[PDB]
């Protein structure tokens, strides 16, 4: 959702690591984590 109004990302990029806290990965690497059969099991919370 953020546009951030890109000016000098080469210096405004390390500021996110100046921040110490990381957002959750938003379902994509979890969709990679859950193996192919467990993606179809009830173990998968991202069935929906």
């Amino acid at each position: 959702f953020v546009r951030e109004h890109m000016a000098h990302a080469t210096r405004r990029l390390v500021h996110f690591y100046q921040a110490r806290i990381d957002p959750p990965r938003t379902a994509n690497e979890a969709k990679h984590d859950f193996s192919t059969k467990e993606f179809a099991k009830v173990d998968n919370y991202l069935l929906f």
């Binding site: 990029l13 110490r20 990965r25 690497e29």
Partner: protein, 96 residues
């Protein structure tokens, strides 16, 4: 350091480039990994808006090199257009 793309972030590489990333991995060694999967900056946080989605990188991080991954990434770059499936099954190439 510029970890601008999801293909193009590397934990130890970005840490030894700028040690703020080394402080980030001091905090969070869960990404300090070849697969990794960094939260990857509000700038270019647009993973869904990216053309290259997550399983490209999370395939390449465990891909098998030498003439098959080089070409199968380009086969993973087949479009999912309706006309792409059309020409694809038309030439008999099995879609995804």
């Amino acid at each position: 350091v510029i970890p601008f793309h999801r293909f193009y972030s590397d934990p130890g590489l970005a840490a030894t480039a700028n040690h703020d990333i080394r402080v980030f991995l001091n905090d969070f060694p869960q990404y300090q990994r070849c697969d990794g999967g960094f939260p990857l900056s509000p700038i270019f946080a647009h993973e869904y808006h990216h053309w290259h989605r997550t399983p490209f990188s999370c395939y390449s991080a465990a891909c098998a090199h030498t003439l098959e991954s080089v070409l199968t990434l380009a086969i993973m770059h087949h479009k999912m257009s309706p006309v792409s499936i059309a020409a694809l099954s038309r030439m008999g190439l099995h879609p995804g």
